[PDB]
Each structure stands twice: as structure tokens, then as C-alpha cells.
Amino acid sequence: FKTIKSDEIFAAAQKLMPGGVSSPVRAFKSVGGQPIVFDRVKDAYAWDVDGNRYIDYVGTWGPAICGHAHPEVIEALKVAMEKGTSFGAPCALENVLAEMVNDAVPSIEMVRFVNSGTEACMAVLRLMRAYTGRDKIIKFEGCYHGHADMFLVKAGSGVATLGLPSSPGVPKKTTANTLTTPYNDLEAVKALFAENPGEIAGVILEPIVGNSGFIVPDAGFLEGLREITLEHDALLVFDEVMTGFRIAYGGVQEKFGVTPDLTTLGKIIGGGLPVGAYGGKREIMQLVAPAGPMYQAGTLSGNPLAMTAGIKTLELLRQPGTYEYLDQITKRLSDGLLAIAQETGHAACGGQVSGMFGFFFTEGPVHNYEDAKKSDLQKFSRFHRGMLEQGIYLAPSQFEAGFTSLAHTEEDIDATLAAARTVMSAL
């Protein structure tokens, strides 16, 4: 297993960019510190600058649900670019993707495209505050909602990975209009509403968390949140930037039947390109400029290249037996991992819903970030490296969810379980 080229490239990288990467988690800091540099990706695999091929489970952090470099997506894009990549004025494609999104996600009656999930979350917070006229927002420990000021407090992703705390460039004057509660603690939320009456704009959360590892909500949690916010004239916002189009076509809101007032989408909606969106009830979206006073803009928003990738990705997911296939192969891989762990003497817990799974090195059960924190990270680090050497690419962090795509085959799942066996028979 040679990584000569990855090593020299990442070495040179550190002198040019902060930590040598464009996003923190790619530095491999909580798993050894030696990242491999990619050259190309195809279907369910990835290739090294050294020639090594891996079966990918990161899937570029959500976007590749259809598989890397889908033939029909890049051909649609090769055709689109001969007409220019960015116009700066409206184009017909915005209208089609927009209509597709309205039909797809329940709560969305009107949309606004942006360039990333971060931008969509910045916008949705401002909108929920503007619509209500209140300033307090209730967020949950372990939920990532983009690298924004108001939300860098017990967030997810790298925050809930390398033990990053609150603030990072944001003052106490920003992270003070944001109340925090433990994920799944319906009672703690009620407390915050009774403790700060008439001043909570709303609650925002990942309906299913993937940024503190995979954590599913309990029996009547989401239903609880919908009712309590209602009783107080507060807005319920679902950050489905990761869950959207993966858990189901209409996301977690469709799968579990709880409808929020606004939702945010990103990742899969751009099909592999920088795109995001925020939408919800009509009367609320009416406040967004130019239709309203709340300002939010973006030079590259709605660009045709992005709209093209977006539309092709949704046409492919709308086909017969898409999610059934994801639930099927992902259940086999998840159950298979937990079985191998049990027979090798390793304590573990996990699960999956459609093409999103989780696996933790602790008996659990995991109900929140604190529970997630009791995992043996030293074992995870060794597990991750071993899997890497066996040709399987896993998220370099215990606090990230795993992903599956329509290009993963039954055989691909069988080889992964085979590697997991050879590996867990060490540690």
C-alpha cells in the first residue's frame, strides 16, 4: 500500500493553504493525519494519485447518490456548456428545477436557489427571525448548519468530530440569540420556551443527524417539536441539506410525515456542483427580495450548469425502485458490520435508513452527541486505517455518517464486509 504521491502532494499543500486542505475534515487529523489525494472518481469507486482504487462510502459527502460521474449527468452537462455556464439573467432551467423541487418536498411551496448549504442556512435563519420578529433560535448539540456566525456553537461535522467548541470568529453578541438543547430532549426544548417566553423565532434541526454520526430521532420527537412550535407561533425548520433526496425523494418530512414550515436543501440537489436551496410556505418566502424587504443574493445562483446537473439528478432518482435498492444494500452492509463486530468481540452499534448509515465503537445506544462521544476513537482510527489499506474508503471521522449510492453493487457490499472481517480481527 504505497502513498508516495499523496504524501508529497499534501506536503506541498500545507505551505499554500491552511492545514493544506479546503475543508478541515479532509486533513485526516482525527484518524492519523495522513490523507490520500484523489485523481478521479467513477461509479462507486475512487482512485489515488498512486494508482490505488477504493470502494467509496464518503460519496463526496452526500452529492454522489447516483454514483460518481454518472454518464447521463456529465453528458447533459457537456451539452449545456456549449451555451455558456453563467448568464446573470433568468433562464428557463431555474423554472423547471424549481417546479421539480416544489413537487418533491412537501413543505416547499416556493424556492430560492443559492450556492451551498451554508448560504441556504444563513438565509433561513434570517428569514425565520424576520417573519416572526423575534431573535432567539433553538438549535441542538451536534447539529451542523453551515459555518455561520450565529450557529458555531456545539455544531456538527468537524466541530462534532475533532472536538471543536463554540465561537471561532463569532462573538458572544452573536452566539447569545441561539439557545442550545440536547438532541432528542423534548423536555429541554419545552423548558427553553417557558424560560424565554414570547422571544423564540423557532427551532431548526437535522431531522436525522449525520454530522455527529448517524443518529435517528426517538418515537415522538419530531411530532413533539411540530406541536410545541405551533402552540407558540414559532417556526419549525428542517435542515435537509444532507437528508433531502437521500432518506426519501421528499426527505425525512415525507418519510416520517412531519411537515416543517421551511426547509433547506443542498448537496444532492446540485448533482455534484455547488448548489443549495431554501423554501417553505408561500407567505413566509414572500419576504425575500425582490418580493420583500429581507435581503439575500448571489451572483452564481440559478446558473444553467447547476440547474442542469440538478434536474438530471432528480430525473434519475424518480425512476422505479431507487430508494428500495438503497435500503436493501445499505441494510446488508450495516447489519453485516454489526455482526462482524459482535463475532470479533468489539462493542458497537449503528443502523441505517435508506442510503445513510452509521456505525459507532460503543455499545450505545446513541441518542445524542454525548452518547456518541463515548466511542473509542483510538479503535476507530486503527479500524479506519486498516479499511483504507484493504481498499475501502470510509469517512475519516467517527462523527460523520456513511453513504451509499445506486452504483454500489451487491458484490461491492460483499467485499467491504470481507475487508471489515480481516481488519476487526486485529485492534
Has 267 been annotated as catalytic? yes
Query: Counting contacts by CB under 8 A, is residue 286 touching a second copy?
Result: yes
239 binds, among ligand PLP, a second copy, none (CB under 5 to 8 A by kind): ligand PLP
**CA-wise closest residue to 354 among 390, 327, 387:** 327
Coil vs helix vs strand at 218? coil
Query: Counting contacts by CB under 6 A, is residue 123 touching ligand PLP?
Result: no
Q: How many residues bind ligand PLP (CB under 6 A)?
A: 18
Per-residue binding string, ligand PLP, 131-150, x by CB under 6 A, is -------------xxx----
Instruction: Find the binder of ligand PLP among 35, 106, 117, 304 (CB under 6 A).
Output: 117
Q: What does the alpha-carbon distance between residue 228 and residue 216 come to, in Å, rounded to a whole number?
A: 20
Query: Counting contacts by CB under 8 A, is residue 176 touching a second copy?
Result: yes
* Pairing mode of beta strands 200-205, 402-403: unpaired
Provide DSSP, 24-55: GGGG-TTTTS----EEEEEBTEEEETTS-EEE
Query: Counting contacts by CB under 8 A, is residue 313 touching a second copy?
Result: no
Among 29-37, 184-192, 224-232, 365-373, which window interacts with a second copy (CB under 8 A)? Answer: 29-37
The nearest distance, CB 57 to ligand PLP, in angstroms, is 16
Has 239 been annotated as catalytic? yes
Contacts (Cβ under 8 Å, ≥6 apart) of 232: 193, 200
Contacts (Cβ under 8 Å, ≥6 apart) of 321: none
Q: How many residues bind a second copy (CB under 8 A)?
A: 128
* Pairing mode of beta strands 402-403, 349-353: unpaired
Q: What does the alpha-carbon distance between residue 409 and residue 405 come to, in Å, rounded to a whole number?
A: 9
Per-residue binding string, ligand PLP, 64-103, x by CB under 6 A, is ----------------------------------------
Catalytic residue among 45, 54, 57, 144: 144
Q: What does the alpha-carbon distance between residue 278 and residue 121 come to, in Å, rounded to a whole number?
A: 8
Residues 174-213 that bind ligand PLP (CB under 6 A): 206, 210-211
Query: Counting contacts by CB under 8 A, is residue 267 touching a second copy?
Result: yes
Among 110-118, 229-237, 317-325, 329-337, which window interacts with a second copy (CB under 8 A)? Answer: 110-118
Query: Counting contacts by CB under 6 A, is residue 121 touching ligand PLP?
Result: yes
78 binds, among ligand PLP, a second copy, none (CB under 5 to 8 A by kind): a second copy
Query: Counting contacts by CB under 8 A, is residue 4 touching a second copy?
Result: no
Question: DSSP label at 397?
Answer: S
The CA-based dihedral angle spanning residues 239, 243, 248, 251, taken in that order and rounded to the nearest 10 degrees: 0
Per-residue binding string, ligand PLP, 97-116, x by CB under 6 A, is -------------------x
Alpha helices in 272-350 (DSSP H): 282-285, 304-317, 322-343
Q: What does the alpha-carbon distance between residue 249 and residue 233 come to, in Å, rounded to a whole number?
A: 29
Catalytic residue among 29, 136, 267, 373: 267
Has 144 been annotated as catalytic? yes
Catalytic residue among 48, 56, 239, 412: 239
For 230, phi then psi, to 5°, come to -55, -55
Provide DSSP, 329-376: HHHHHHHHHHHHHHHTT---EEEEETTEEEEESSS----SHHHHHTS-
Looking at the Cβ atoms of 300 and 427, the one nearer to a second copy is 300
Q: Site residues (CB under 6 A) for ligand PLP?
A: 116-118, 121, 144-146, 206, 210-211, 239, 241-242, 266, 276, 298-300
Give the residue numbers annotated as catalytic, written as ranges: 144, 239, 267
